[PDB]
Amino acid sequence: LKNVFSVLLIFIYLLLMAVAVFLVYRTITDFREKLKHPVMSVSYKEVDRYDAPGIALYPGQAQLLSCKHHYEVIPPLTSPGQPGDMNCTTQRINYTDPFSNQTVKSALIVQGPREVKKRELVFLQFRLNKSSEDFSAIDYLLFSSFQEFLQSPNRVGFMQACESAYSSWKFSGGFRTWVKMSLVKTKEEDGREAVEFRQETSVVNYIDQRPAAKKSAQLFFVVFEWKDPFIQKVQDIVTANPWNTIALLCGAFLALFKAAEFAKLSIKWMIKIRKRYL
Amino acid sequence: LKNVFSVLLIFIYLLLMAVAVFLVYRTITDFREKLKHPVMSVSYKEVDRYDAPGIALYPGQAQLLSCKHHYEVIPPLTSPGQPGDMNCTTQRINYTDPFSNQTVKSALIVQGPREVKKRELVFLQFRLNKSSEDFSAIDYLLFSSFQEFLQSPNRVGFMQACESAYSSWKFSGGFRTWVKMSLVKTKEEDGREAVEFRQETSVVNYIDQRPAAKKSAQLFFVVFEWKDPFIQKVQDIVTANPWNTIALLCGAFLALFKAAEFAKLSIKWMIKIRKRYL
Amino acid sequence: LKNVFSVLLIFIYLLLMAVAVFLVYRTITDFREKLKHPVMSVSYKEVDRYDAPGIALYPGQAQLLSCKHHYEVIPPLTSPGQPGDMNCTTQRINYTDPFSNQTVKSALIVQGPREVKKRELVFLQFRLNKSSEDFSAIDYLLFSSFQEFLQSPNRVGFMQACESAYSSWKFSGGFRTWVKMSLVKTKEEDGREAVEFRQETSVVNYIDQRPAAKKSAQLFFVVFEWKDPFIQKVQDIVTANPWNTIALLCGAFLALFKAAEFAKLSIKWMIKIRKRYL
Ligand SMILES: *[C@@H]1O[C@H](CO)[C@@H](O)[C@H](O)[C@H]1NC(C)=O
Ligand SMILES: *[C@@H]1O[C@H](CO)[C@@H](O)[C@H](O)[C@H]1NC(C)=O
Ligand SMILES: *[C@@H]1O[C@H](CO)[C@@H](O)[C@H](O)[C@H]1NC(C)=O
Ligand SMILES: *[C@@H]1O[C@H](CO)[C@@H](O)[C@H](O)[C@H]1NC(C)=O
Ligand SMILES: *[C@@H]1O[C@H](CO)[C@@H](O)[C@H](O)[C@H]1NC(C)=O
Ligand SMILES: *[C@@H]1O[C@H](CO)[C@@H](O)[C@H](O)[C@H]1NC(C)=O
Ligand SMILES: *[C@@H]1O[C@H](CO)[C@@H](O)[C@H](O)[C@H]1NC(C)=O
Ligand SMILES: *[C@@H]1O[C@H](CO)[C@@H](O)[C@H](O)[C@H]1NC(C)=O
Ligand SMILES: *[C@@H]1O[C@H](CO)[C@@H](O)[C@H](O)[C@H]1NC(C)=O
Ligand SMILES: *[C@@H]1O[C@H](CO)[C@@H](O)[C@H](O)[C@H]1NC(C)=O
Ligand SMILES: *[C@@H]1O[C@H](CO)[C@@H](O)[C@H](O)[C@H]1NC(C)=O
Ligand SMILES: *[C@@H]1O[C@H](CO)[C@@H](O)[C@H](O)[C@H]1NC(C)=O
């Protein structure tokens, strides 16, 4: 009975120590989250399948020509500059620019590839007969998930928040750019997880054998693909790996207890020395 | 004699504690490696010299024009569109595509630069008289080491495994693309170290003064160079830095021993209290 | 009085333990910094505002046409190929190439954008009437701070050190390349903090409606912008997060003290056993 009660008391005291360490760690985290610009760590996590991203195009006057999903290969085009073979989950929304409130931007959101293991990719074609601009390009930005946008209650605000995110790029005209997008998730101290993208473009020239009559119009090609299944995650160094902080706190508490034992021994030793001397 | 025997027993017990911690850590690692998709950390390691990589080109109908090694500068071309000055360790192998078994792909593997400190780079030229394709590009993928491929027993399987790796890109025609490749090594739980590359292309237009008769043929230029000596290494967070796990385990064991001491004191205290009361 | 003296002695012994741990950690760091090629970790740190970088162009025979600061948008060009609207903090310096001492390179350093939150960007235009070269490009490299170069005592040596850094790229002619530069700081064991850049170019074709007489001259466009406020910091794994090493050292010392206590108990136990037996 004494042995089993001692084991139970061991469990109780271990639980009490765990609770104390947890409270101290929570206090440390609550104090950290108040300060701005903390040191953040990097953690990767491979995923078998990606969540479907959203590719918000900005054709403007350009007309979407063809959208199709392919796997690790692009079949030769049947006829450039001709519509058809279009089936992508495309949602059309347009809103005021958060930066310049005076201008409204038309956004074409296309569901991105999700089977990274199968090298799934999305191929888009655009056409523009007449253009008055020095540079021919279409803006596009990538956000975390297409489903979140689809079921979002405030669609306009979500797109403005995406514009605030740093994932905007361009692709040229007369070239087919292969975009290998990478996902980077950063967790803010407030709790929200901001998402930004990294890309590795591969610009490829497009050779056109079409008659000189139609050469005035310019064709835009772009391919979106996940570079690697790994997802970069950025978080506060203390919060990202709490086990290091827990180990440090346990070491500090054990050092304090050892110091208490040392003091208890030393006071007895000095009392004995004083009694022997006087 | 008592003091020296006490020191020896200190060594024995320290060794026993180290063995116990090592066994617990090995059990933790063996349990981790079973689960899929673990959290992985990032570690960089500068290298004075790089291992020679392999650049597997896919010219197809294109003919390799010139290969040469240079240091931080490209001398002006003597005559574009003309062969000669070709000396690279090139191995020609062709095999069935692992994705689409019906197609065989011709791969030209060229030994890559290895002196990153000297900014060594490899310059390649390609020519194509007649082409029937909308986009003019040559596929290329990068694997970890050329020597491994050279001495591999199953050459075909090694190339298929490289195709499975996510390091395939393209470079355009009529442009000279400077490819700054970065090495990323990820260690799987099974033990193998998968290798993938990251690139930062710099597309540069090519101006041709050649006669209009030869303008039909298109010239491909590409330059491969190591961006930085640092090599990104990705590994499981527990296994990458085992010292954190060792420290946590030592802290846990010391906390358990402190709890044992606390129980031994508390049982005596409560027994004394009970005896005094009754 | 005894209690307060015991508390004071607790403080003294805790300070002594902290000093011992600090000395051991300093010894470990001093031993580490001697060895070459250590394992380095990655830490990110968001900044509200960036320090102004330096963009050292290499126009050569090209003449700078226009420099202007913009926010997240490029207004349409008033007239391509015409100077004016030029106000950037440009410093002109030229020096001998550290790699090839025989050639002197003319560097045009332009102060880069610093308000990443406002998506500030710098737009540059270049012109070249007559050129004798196969490829039309302008070299450029990025260093950490423009102010450091401006107030540097040895300007020539600073530029040579920047050339030694791996942050050199090119942008094509007849295209507008959007450069999204990222800051990577690596701390060497000697103490200096080398700085290298990462970029994500977005090549955009430029359509010219200018008369065929002026088509001989080629126009260069480039845009520089900070991709994200996060700054990648690379440091030795032990030095980057010293708290892990401190926790491990405290755990080791506490384990040694526990082993000492175990030996003190075990010697008494075996002495008692020997006395009972004989
Ligand atoms: C492909 O297009 C057809 C209409 O042409 C549509 O019915 C079908 O659902 C589409 N499939 C996918 C996967 O988009
Ligand atoms: C989008 O733009 C159109 C005009 O092009 C106009 O109907 C309105 O601004 C927006 N309408 C839709 C479809 O949201
Ligand atoms: C632009 O309009 C928005 C609408 O909310 C407003 O918040 C912002 O201050 C305006 N900026 C101006 C006046 O330029
Ligand atoms: C562009 O030109 C084509 C030529 O057939 C025509 O069919 C189409 O209606 C025009 N409008 C756009 C911008 O697509
Ligand atoms: C360069 O080419 C010559 C043949 O033209 C060859 O003998 C020599 O080994 C080559 N050198 C290198 C380093 O490739
Ligand atoms: C490579 O392709 C050629 C035909 O171009 C043929 O000999 C066979 O498929 C392969 N031969 C070699 C050299 O491996
Ligand atoms: C393609 O051929 C390979 C040869 O191993 C086979 O494993 C795979 O199932 C085939 N796929 C088909 C039938 O499309
Ligand atoms: C291509 O054209 C050149 C012109 O001289 C000729 O020498 C060569 O044999 C042709 N074949 C290829 C594809 O190199
Ligand atoms: C802009 O240019 C004018 C001269 O044209 C100069 O006085 C002014 O300081 C410049 N402003 C900036 C911010 O460069
Ligand atoms: C820069 O080059 C010029 C010649 O173009 C010459 O004056 C000297 O080499 C350098 N001068 C300056 C302005 O530093
Ligand atoms: C180039 O000149 C520099 C000047 O310091 C010198 O250090 C270097 O050895 C020279 N290299 C040669 C001789 O090619
Ligand atoms: C280039 O041509 C223009 C045409 O007006 C002329 O004004 C200028 O002086 C020439 N020199 C350069 C290289 O700018």
Residue numbers in the entry:
A (entry chain B), B (entry chain C), C (entry chain A): 62 to 339
Paper lines:
Proton-activated chloride (PAC) channel is a ubiquitously expressed pH-sensing ion channel, encoded by PACC1 (TMEM206). PAC regulates endosomal acidification and macropinosome shrinkage by releasing chloride from the organelle lumens. PAC is a homotrimer that forms a chloride-selective pore in the membrane, and it senses changes in pH via its large extracellular domain (ECD). PAC channel is closed at neutral pH and becomes activated when the pH drops below 5.5.
To reveal the mechanism underlying PIP2 inhibition, we solved the cryo-EM structure of PAC in nanodiscs with 0.5 mM diC8-PIP2 at pH 4.0 to an overall resolution of 2.70 Å. The structure adopts a conformation similar to the previously reported desensitized state at low pH. However, a strong branched lipid density is observed on the cryo-EM map of the PAC channel in the outer membrane leaflet, between TM1 and TM2 of adjacent subunits. When trying to fit a diC8-PIP2 molecule into this density, we found that the phosphatidyl group is reasonably well defined, with its phosphate group forming a salt bridge interaction with R93 and its two acyl tails interacting with a number of hydrophobic residues on both transmembrane helices, including W304. In contrast, the hydrophilic head group, such as inositol-4,5-bisphosphate (Ins(4,5)P2) moiety of PIP2, is not resolved and therefore not modeled. Nevertheless, the local biochemical environment of the site is consistent with PIP2 binding, in which the hypothetical location of Ins(4,5)P2 is surrounded by several positively charged residues, including K97, K106, and K294. Moreover, small, but notable, conformational changes are observed in the transmembrane helices (TM1 and TM2) upon adding PIP2, which supports the binding of PIP2 to PAC. The pore radius profile is similar to the desensitized state of PAC without PIP2, with the smallest radius of 0.43 Å. Therefore, the PIP2-bound conformation also represents a non-conductive state. When overexpressed in PAC knockout (KO) HEK293 cells, mutation of any residues R93, K97, K106, K294, and W304 to alanine significantly relieved the inhibition by PIP2 on pH 5.0-induced PAC currents, confirming that this was indeed its binding site on the channel.
